[PDB]
Amino acid sequence: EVMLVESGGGLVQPGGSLRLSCATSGFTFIDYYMSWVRQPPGKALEWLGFIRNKGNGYTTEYSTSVKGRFTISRDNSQSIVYLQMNTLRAEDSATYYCARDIGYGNSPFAYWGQGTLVTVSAASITPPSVYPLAPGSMVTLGCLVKGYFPEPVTVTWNSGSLSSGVHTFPAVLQSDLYTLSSSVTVPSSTWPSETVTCNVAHPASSTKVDKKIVPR
């Protein structure tokens, strides 16, 4: 049924511009307002604006904070809504969401996209170095994911087969570079007997690395 899928996010230099899209399916796109909402990391949600339905002529409304700087537009034949952002600054660094707003008798913001992270900085794009963390009843292994930019990375273990006993920690910034670690606890009766591998992805640099956790 209803799906909103975003893309276009990533790194952009201060003063720069960017266009995020939001592809919809599973409803009659033209009869619905669409909204854009942003969330700086750690902070509250902020409504940015909407574009109206066919009934109201596809007209647009923006929050006081982004009027004249951001533009919402739509491709009705493809069911995409866009958000064009110009003159980006530090404070614009956030996760950006699209959401179905009003349409038919329906409540707005029932459906949301997964969001896309926009980062505004002078800093370059650096791939992560991915290191295995091996030890010295249950056993804790890890992966250190060091020296990357910008966020996000994603980490899975055994391509998704291991999910409980996992703690992926939020990244920390150290002088232009991010460092993140993931951790997995498994029963020692299965290690190293059955293998354990962390899968790290950095889309911002086409990196996809697997690290087998090998004993010392």
């Binding site: 509250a44 949600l45 913001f109 949301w112 890890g142 010392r216």
Partner: protein, 216 residues
């Protein structure tokens, strides 16, 4: 028009009533309707609609969540709180300028849990790359109050320590922490014993984890 949320942060034990206030700076009601929405947001997920038009439960959402109020004063009620309820909750004006309130973080209270500490020396591939990080994980503890001191050859090291907490765990209500001691290979190789000491209320003395580099 601004929406103000009550405590901003709230702790409630399992099984009990959580009550989150939302106050609007101006009435958001008409004769017919009160235009208030309530959302739930977990880390790295989009917000989820819980309550529309002030008191109606969204389809799919469990019946422990309920809303109420009119005019300017509104309430979200969660009873009984479950472990999966650990999250941030936002109210929102669901028409006109669609303002979001600032959020209330809900913490699930539970019995104390001692941390499980694991220490990890630099990976030998990282040493091959010319870096060195000593990582130790402090897993599945409660309350969230914890600190890590590092000792290199007996003396405390304050600089270059990266700390990171998970958000409260959806299943067991604990917190996890990653403490990464960042170091030049130079200083790694010139010293021998590495120690991370966790201070937590579950113990009258630090939970200590150690290794010697020459013994590796």
């Amino acid at each position: 028009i601004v929406l103000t949320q009550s405590p901003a942060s709230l702790a409630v034990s399992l099984g009990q009533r959580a009550t989150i206030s939302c106050r609007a700076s101006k009435s958001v009601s008409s004769s017919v309707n009160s235009y208030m929405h309530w959302y739930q947001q977990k880390p790295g997920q989009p917000p989820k609609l819980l309550i529309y038009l002030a008191s109606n439960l969204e389809s799919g959402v469990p019946a422990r969540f309920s809303g109420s109020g009119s005019g300017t004063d509104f309430t979200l009620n969660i009873h009984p709180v479950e472990e999966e309820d650990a999250a941030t909750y936002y109210c929102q004006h669901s028409r006109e300028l669609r303002t979001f309130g600032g959020g209330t973080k809900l913490e699930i209270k539970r019995a104390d849990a001692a941390p499980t500490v694991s220490i990890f020396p630099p990976s030998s591939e990282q040493l091959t790359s010319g870096g060195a990080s000593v990582v130790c994980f402090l897993n599945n503890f409660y309350p969230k109050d914890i600190n890590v001191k590092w000792k290199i050859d007996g003396s405390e090291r304050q600089n270059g320590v990266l700390n990171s907490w998970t958000d409260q765990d959806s299943k067991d209500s604990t917190y996890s922490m990653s403490s990464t001691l960042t170091l030049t290979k130079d200083e790694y190789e010139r010293h021998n014993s590495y120690t991370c000491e966790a201070t937590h209320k579950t113990s009258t003395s630090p939970v200590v984890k150690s290794f010697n580099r020459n013994e590796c």
